[PDB]
């Protein structure tokens, strides 16, 4: 397995079994040493204040978050960021249906859009009550992050002169979203509570509630 | 006046899965050192030790059946027991139904067995050396 790259002669098959045995002993000791280290007790790359939640946003009850949010922060979110799995994938409608009006009273949005669903995002979040404002453009090849705002950002909380909209890849030929955007937020809201939907373990930064099926 | 270190634990208790935060509320870094879907919960290590008494060392297929409802990895059982028996090769122990209290003795006796002959690594006695 694969059946065609495998040997069929006895001399070829015995030789291969002999080398696999040696190799299982090798990856055995690497797995004992891995588990023991993890066991007693290694530290992950995750910051301590991060707040992961593995759930499916269709199945997830947002009210459980809403209530536990008010219970602890005393306020709804300041900044919400998204990277919808456009159509592993979610029907364009499903994400549209998500109750993101409930989730934030006054603050910003950040939605990542590919050229194919660029227009869709605008009317997706104008539905969410957000007012389209600004576009952050990422150069790797282009991907656009659309920004919106509802209610009042007049408060001193937010900082109007946020960092320069353009942004670059931290590495060359990279596919994960770049970290700088988490400091754009940090200039825009320092130590503000933030939500990320469609998050990923490498999107785990502290101060951030991250919801993702892959967390 | 919003304490984020307390706000983090206070959220993790009410929203995060049982695997992500300790009832303490702090973060369970053991969970992120293993890929998503291949983490080994403690409710799984007790499920295995239990399987050794009812089905013995060799019958992984039968154990995965009763304790893990057919969802666990036969080879991850095959290895996690080596760590229970502190030995790299468990061919000797094939088919022996071993009580949970006999396992620690078998581990301690194989660790100490390992320690003496300097054939011990990573709390595991390597009776097979390549």
């Amino acid at each position: 397995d694969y059946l065609d790259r495998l040997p069929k002669s006895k001399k070829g098959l015995q030789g291969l079994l002999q080398d696999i045995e040696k190799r299982i002993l090798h990856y055995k000791q690497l797995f004992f040493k891995e588990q023991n280290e993890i066991a007693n007790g290694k530290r992950s790359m995750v910051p301590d204040n991060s707040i992961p939640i593995c759930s499916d946003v269709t199945k997830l009850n947002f009210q459980a978050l809403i209530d536990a949010q008010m219970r602890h922060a005393g306020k709804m979110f300041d900044v919400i960021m998204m990277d919808p799995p456009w159509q592993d994938s979610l029907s364009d409608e499903k994400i549209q249906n998500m109750p993101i009006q409930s989730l934030q009273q006054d603050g910003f949005i950040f939605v990542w859009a590919i050229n194919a669903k660029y227009r869709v995002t605008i009317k997706m979040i104008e539905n969410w009550g957000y007012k389209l404002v600004d576009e952050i453009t990422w150069v790797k090849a282009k991907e656009s992050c659309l920004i919106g705002v509802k209610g009042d950002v007049d408060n001193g909380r937010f900082k109007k002169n946020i960092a320069s909209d353009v942004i670059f890849s931290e590495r060359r030929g990279q596919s994960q979203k770049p970290e700088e955007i988490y400091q754009y937020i940090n200039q825009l809201c320092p130590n503000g509570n933030y939500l990320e939907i469609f998050a990923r373990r490498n999107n785990l930064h502290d101060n951030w509630v991250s919801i993702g099926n892959e967390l | 006046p919003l304490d984020f270190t307390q706000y983090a634990k206070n959220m993790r208790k009410d929203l995060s899965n049982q695997d992500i935060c300790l009832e303490d509320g702090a973060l369970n870094h053991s969970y992120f050192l293993t890929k998503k879907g291949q983490y080994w919960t403690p409710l799984n290590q007790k499920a295995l030790q239990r399987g050794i008494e009812l089905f013995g060392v060799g019958n992984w297929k039968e154990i995965n059946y009763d304790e893990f409802s057919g969802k666990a990895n036969i080879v991850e059982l095959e290895l996690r027991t080596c760590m229970i028996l502190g030995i790299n090769d468990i061919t000797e122990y094939y088919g022996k139904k071993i009580s949970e209290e006999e396992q620690e003795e078998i581990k301690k006796s194989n660790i100490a067995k390992g320690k003496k002959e300097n054939k011990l690594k990573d709390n595991i006695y390597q009776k097979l050396q390549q």
Partner: peptide
């Protein structure tokens, strides 16, 4: 990139297939 577990899984499954062809003879 693979993990240590995933590699051991391929290795065991491979071992089973070859042991099957070694027995088929």
């Amino acid at each position: 990139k693979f993990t240590n577990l995933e590699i051991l899984t391929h290795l065991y499954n491979l071992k089973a297939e070859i042991v099957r062809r070694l027995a088929e003879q």
